[PDB]
Design a protein around this ligand. Structure first.
Ligand SMILES: *[C@@H]1O[C@H](CO[C@@H]2O[C@@H](C)[C@@H](O)[C@@H](O)[C@@H]2O)[C@@H](O[C@@H]2O[C@H](CO)[C@@H](O[C@@H]3O[C@H](CO)[C@@H](O)[C@H](O)[C@@H]3O)[C@H](O)[C@H]2NC(C)=O)[C@H](O)[C@H]1NC(C)=O
Length: 244
């Protein structure tokens, strides 16, 4: 029977849903290694919403090549790996270490550009719903109001992307940004579906929520962010349009 893999050789390069785990063979060969058997057990997570008991599993990595790409993992989560080496006559002792998947952006609610709850010359009111954590808690919500320039083509030069750079309304004209952040909430607001009024003129976390100009065409996105380990990740979804 073979020795164990040296615990200190086990290293992992980690992603949102994958961990590439890598090690070195046991210190001296009793006999040829035929497979490594690996258990991964979900240890802990920054996500408040998932039950980890079902997230564990086993890998019988056939063959004696010393790495494996773990797949389908859950983000923001620490997995403990136990590696056993096997001579054809049986396993060596286990060695074990743990690594953590990186967090991912929260998953927004589904929107279909339903006609808003009410609309005026200066305001639009829409029903917001809480986003779900996927790897880390939702930290803040942000609301993006974006002006439409006149266009002569549908086509885009590049992929559609969200808004990581916040901008207060009063600075957009100076900075020539196409959008402004109308509001930000701590995510303890919007724990259940409740309407929100674009342009209600009140200030949320330092963002003024400027009323809209009726001769301007606008589209509004609802965005959410999650934070851990200095990585902070966002997603956004368009909730309404206005023109006049
Ligand atoms: C990892 O595995 C390789 C592959 O060996 C093959 O796969 C194993 C999982 C077992 O099923 C083995 O029974 C099987 O041979 C080992 O490397 C080298 O593989 C070659 C090809 O099979 C072996 O070749 C033979 O060796 C004999 C003796 O020298 C010659 O007379 C033959 O002509 C033939 O070429 C070779 O033995 C094998 N090398 C060694 C040192 O065993 C590899 O060693 C193994 N490593 C570990 C750490 O497990």
């Amino acid at each position: 029977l073979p020795g164990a893999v040296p615990t200190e050789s086990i290293q992992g390069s980690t992603f949102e849903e994958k961990i590439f785990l890598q090690w070195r063979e046991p210190t001296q060969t009793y006999g040829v290694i035929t497979l490594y058997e690996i258990t991964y057990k979900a240890v802990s997570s920054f996500d408040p919403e998932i039950d980890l008991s079902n997230q564990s599993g086993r890998v019988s990595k056939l063959g004696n090549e010393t790495h494996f790409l773990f797949f389908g993992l859950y983000p923001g989560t620490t997995y403990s790996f136990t590696i056993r080496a096997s001579t054809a006559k049986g396993f060596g002792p286990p060695a074990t270490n743990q690594f953590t998947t990186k967090i991912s952006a929260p998953s927004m609610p589904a929107y279909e550009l339903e006609t808003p709850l009410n609309q005026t010359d200066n305001t639009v009111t829409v029903m917001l719903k809480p986003a779900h954590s996927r790897g880390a808690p939702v930290s803040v919500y942000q609301i993006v109001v974006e002006e439409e320039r006149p266009r002569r083509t549908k086509k885009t030069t590049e992929i559609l992307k969200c808004y990581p750079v916040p901008i207060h309304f009063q600075n957009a004209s100076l900075l020539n940004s196409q959008y402004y952040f109308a509001a930000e909430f701590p995510a303890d607001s919007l724990q259940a579906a409740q309407p929100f009024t674009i342009g209600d003129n009140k200030t949320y976390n330092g963002y003024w929520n400027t009323p809209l100009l009726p001769y301007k065409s606008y589209r509004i996105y609802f965005q959410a962010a999650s934070r851990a380990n200095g990585e902070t990740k966002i997603d956004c979804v368009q909730v309404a349009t206005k023109g006049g």
